[PDB]
PDB file of C-alpha atoms in Angstrom:
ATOM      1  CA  UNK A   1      52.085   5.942  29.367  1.00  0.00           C
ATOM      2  CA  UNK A   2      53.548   7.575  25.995  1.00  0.00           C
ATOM      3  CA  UNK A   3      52.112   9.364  23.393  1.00  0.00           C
ATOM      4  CA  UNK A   4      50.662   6.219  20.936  1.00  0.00           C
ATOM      5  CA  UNK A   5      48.579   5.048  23.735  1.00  0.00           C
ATOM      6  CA  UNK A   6      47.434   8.522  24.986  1.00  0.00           C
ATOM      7  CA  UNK A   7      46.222   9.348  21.614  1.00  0.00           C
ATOM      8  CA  UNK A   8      44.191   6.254  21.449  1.00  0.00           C
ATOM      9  CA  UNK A   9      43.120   6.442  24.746  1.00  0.00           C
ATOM     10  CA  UNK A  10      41.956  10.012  24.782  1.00  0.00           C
ATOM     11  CA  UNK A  11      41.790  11.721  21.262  1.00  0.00           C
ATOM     12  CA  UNK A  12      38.775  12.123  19.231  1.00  0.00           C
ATOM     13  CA  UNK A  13      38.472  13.901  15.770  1.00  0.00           C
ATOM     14  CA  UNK A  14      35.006  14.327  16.101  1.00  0.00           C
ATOM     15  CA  UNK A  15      32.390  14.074  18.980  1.00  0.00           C
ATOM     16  CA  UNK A  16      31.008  10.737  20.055  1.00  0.00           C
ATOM     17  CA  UNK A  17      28.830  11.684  23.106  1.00  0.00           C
ATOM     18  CA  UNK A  18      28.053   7.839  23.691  1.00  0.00           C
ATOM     19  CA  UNK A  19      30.009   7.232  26.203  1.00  0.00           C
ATOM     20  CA  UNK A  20      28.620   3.851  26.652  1.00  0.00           C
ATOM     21  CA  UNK A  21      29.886   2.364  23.102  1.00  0.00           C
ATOM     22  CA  UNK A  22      33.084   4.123  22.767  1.00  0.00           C
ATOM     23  CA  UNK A  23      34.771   2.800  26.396  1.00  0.00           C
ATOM     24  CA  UNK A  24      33.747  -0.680  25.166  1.00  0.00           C
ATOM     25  CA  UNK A  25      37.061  -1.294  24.165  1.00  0.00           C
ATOM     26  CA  UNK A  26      39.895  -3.596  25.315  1.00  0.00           C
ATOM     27  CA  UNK A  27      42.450  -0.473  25.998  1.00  0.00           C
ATOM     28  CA  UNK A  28      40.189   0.325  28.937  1.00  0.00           C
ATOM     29  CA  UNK A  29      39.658  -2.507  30.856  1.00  0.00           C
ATOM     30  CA  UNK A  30      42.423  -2.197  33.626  1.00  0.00           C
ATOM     31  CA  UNK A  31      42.966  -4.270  36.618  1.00  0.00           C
ATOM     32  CA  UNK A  32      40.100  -7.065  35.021  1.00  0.00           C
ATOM     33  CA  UNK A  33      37.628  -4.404  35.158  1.00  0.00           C
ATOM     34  CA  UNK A  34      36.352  -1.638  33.207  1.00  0.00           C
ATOM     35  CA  UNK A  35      38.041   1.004  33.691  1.00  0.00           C
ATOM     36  CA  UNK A  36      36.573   3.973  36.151  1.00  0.00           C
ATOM     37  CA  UNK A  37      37.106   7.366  33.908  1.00  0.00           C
ATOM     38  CA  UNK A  38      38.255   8.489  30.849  1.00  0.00           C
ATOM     39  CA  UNK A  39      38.457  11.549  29.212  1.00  0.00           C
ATOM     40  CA  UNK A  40      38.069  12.485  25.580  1.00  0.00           C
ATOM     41  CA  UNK A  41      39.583  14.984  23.993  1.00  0.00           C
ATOM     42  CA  UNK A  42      37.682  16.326  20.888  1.00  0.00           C
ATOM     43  CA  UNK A  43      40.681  17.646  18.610  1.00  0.00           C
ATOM     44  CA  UNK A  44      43.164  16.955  16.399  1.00  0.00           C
ATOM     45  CA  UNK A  45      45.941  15.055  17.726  1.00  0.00           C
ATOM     46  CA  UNK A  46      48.915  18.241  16.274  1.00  0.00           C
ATOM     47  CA  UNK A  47      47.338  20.581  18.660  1.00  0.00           C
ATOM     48  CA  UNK A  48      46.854  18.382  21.940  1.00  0.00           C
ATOM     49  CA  UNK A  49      50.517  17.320  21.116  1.00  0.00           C
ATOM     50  CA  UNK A  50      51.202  21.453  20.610  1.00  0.00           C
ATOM     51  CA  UNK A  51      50.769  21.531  24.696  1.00  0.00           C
ATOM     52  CA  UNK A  52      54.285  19.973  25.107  1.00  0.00           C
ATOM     53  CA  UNK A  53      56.561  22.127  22.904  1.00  0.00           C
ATOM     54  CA  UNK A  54      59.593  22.797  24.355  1.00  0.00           C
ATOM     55  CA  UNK A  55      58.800  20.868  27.533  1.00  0.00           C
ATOM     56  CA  UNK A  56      61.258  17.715  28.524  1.00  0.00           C
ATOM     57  CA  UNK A  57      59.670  16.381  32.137  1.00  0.00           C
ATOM     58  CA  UNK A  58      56.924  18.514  33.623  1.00  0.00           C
ATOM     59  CA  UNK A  59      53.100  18.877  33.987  1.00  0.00           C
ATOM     60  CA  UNK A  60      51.541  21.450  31.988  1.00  0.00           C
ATOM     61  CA  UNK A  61      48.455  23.095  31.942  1.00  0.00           C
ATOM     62  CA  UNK A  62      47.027  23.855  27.739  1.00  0.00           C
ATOM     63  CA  UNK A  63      46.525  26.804  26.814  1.00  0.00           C
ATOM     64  CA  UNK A  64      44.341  26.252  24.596  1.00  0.00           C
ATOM     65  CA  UNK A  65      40.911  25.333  25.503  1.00  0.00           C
ATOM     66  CA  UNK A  66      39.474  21.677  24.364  1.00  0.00           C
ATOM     67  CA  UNK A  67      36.179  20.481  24.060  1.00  0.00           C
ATOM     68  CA  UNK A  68      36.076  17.423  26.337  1.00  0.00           C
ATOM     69  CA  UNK A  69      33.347  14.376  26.946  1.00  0.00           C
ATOM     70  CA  UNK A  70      34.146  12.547  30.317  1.00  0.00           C
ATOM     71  CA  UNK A  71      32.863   8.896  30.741  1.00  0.00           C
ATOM     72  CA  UNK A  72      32.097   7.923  34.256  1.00  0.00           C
ATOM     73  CA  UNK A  73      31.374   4.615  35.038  1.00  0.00           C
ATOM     74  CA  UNK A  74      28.300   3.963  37.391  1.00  0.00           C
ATOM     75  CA  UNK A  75      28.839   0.212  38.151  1.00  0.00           C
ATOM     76  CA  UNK A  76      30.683  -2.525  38.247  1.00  0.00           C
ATOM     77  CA  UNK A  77      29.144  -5.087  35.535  1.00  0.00           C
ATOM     78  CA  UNK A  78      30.110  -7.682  32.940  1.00  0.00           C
ATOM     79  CA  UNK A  79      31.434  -6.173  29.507  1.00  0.00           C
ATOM     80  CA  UNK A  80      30.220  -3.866  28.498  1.00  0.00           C
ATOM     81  CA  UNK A  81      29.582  -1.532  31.610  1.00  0.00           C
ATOM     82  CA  UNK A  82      27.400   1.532  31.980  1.00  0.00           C
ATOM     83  CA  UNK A  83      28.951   4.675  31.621  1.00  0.00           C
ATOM     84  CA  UNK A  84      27.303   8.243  32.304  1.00  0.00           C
ATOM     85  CA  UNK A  85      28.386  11.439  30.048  1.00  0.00           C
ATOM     86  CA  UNK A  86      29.958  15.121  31.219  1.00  0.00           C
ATOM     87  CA  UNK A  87      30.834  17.243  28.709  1.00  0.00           C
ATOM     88  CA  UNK A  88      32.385  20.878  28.813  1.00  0.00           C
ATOM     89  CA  UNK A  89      35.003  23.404  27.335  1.00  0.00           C
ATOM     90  CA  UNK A  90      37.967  24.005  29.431  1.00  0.00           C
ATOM     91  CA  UNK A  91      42.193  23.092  29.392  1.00  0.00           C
ATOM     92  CA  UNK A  92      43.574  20.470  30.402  1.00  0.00           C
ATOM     93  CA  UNK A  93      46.866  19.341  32.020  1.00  0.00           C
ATOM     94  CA  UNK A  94      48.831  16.841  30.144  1.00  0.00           C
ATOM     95  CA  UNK A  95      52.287  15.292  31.601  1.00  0.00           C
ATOM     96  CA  UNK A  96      54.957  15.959  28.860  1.00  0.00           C
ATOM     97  CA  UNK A  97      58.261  14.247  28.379  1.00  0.00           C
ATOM     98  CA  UNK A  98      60.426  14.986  25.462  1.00  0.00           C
ATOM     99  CA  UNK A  99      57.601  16.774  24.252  1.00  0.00           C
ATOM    100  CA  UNK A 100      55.197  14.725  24.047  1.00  0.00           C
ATOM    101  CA  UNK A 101      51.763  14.274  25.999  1.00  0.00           C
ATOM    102  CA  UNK A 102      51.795  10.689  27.739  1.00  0.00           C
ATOM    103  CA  UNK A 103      49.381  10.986  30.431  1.00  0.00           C
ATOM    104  CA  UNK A 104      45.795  13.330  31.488  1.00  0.00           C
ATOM    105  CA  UNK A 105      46.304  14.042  34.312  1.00  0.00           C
ATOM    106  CA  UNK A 106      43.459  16.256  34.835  1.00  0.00           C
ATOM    107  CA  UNK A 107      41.135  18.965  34.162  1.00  0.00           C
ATOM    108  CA  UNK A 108      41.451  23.092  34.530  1.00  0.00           C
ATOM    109  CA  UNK A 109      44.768  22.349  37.364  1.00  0.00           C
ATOM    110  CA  UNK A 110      47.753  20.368  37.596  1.00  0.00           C
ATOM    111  CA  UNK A 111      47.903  17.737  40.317  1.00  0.00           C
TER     112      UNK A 111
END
């Protein structure tokens, strides 16, 4: 929703492939339940922020290329809830207002 909670909601300095300990976390639990994907972005938070320079209201697609871990849940359980792992290289389109990334809103294409 702006760019303090995307970076805690996405951004990773380093890679935590446990997708089942990281999502355990209060910031995902939306609508009661755990929430149904997430992605993580392994990277500092300058670059993924770099994506939106110069850009006031728009979806863009990075240009740069991210290493990302993807953290689908299986089921619907009690706290905390399984979660399988996809990782991969590839951009990623950000929405950016005022220059700044506030919400994924996908991978390799823009809605």
């Amino acid at each position: 929703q702006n760019w303090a909670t995307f970076q805690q909601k996405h951004i990773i300095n380093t890679p935590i492939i446990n997708c089942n300990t990281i999502m355990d976390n209060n910031i995902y639990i939306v609508g009661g339940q755990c929430k149904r994907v997430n992605t993580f972005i392994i990277s500092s938070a300058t670059t993924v922020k770099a994506i939106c320079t110069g850009v006031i209201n728009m979806n863009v697609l990075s240009t740069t290329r991210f290493q990302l871990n993807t953290c689908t849940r299986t089921s619907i359980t009690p706290r905390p809830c399984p979660y399988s792992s996809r990782t991969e290289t590839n951009y990623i389109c950000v929405k950016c207002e005022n220059q700044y990334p506030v919400h994924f809103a996908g991978i390799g294409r823009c809605p």
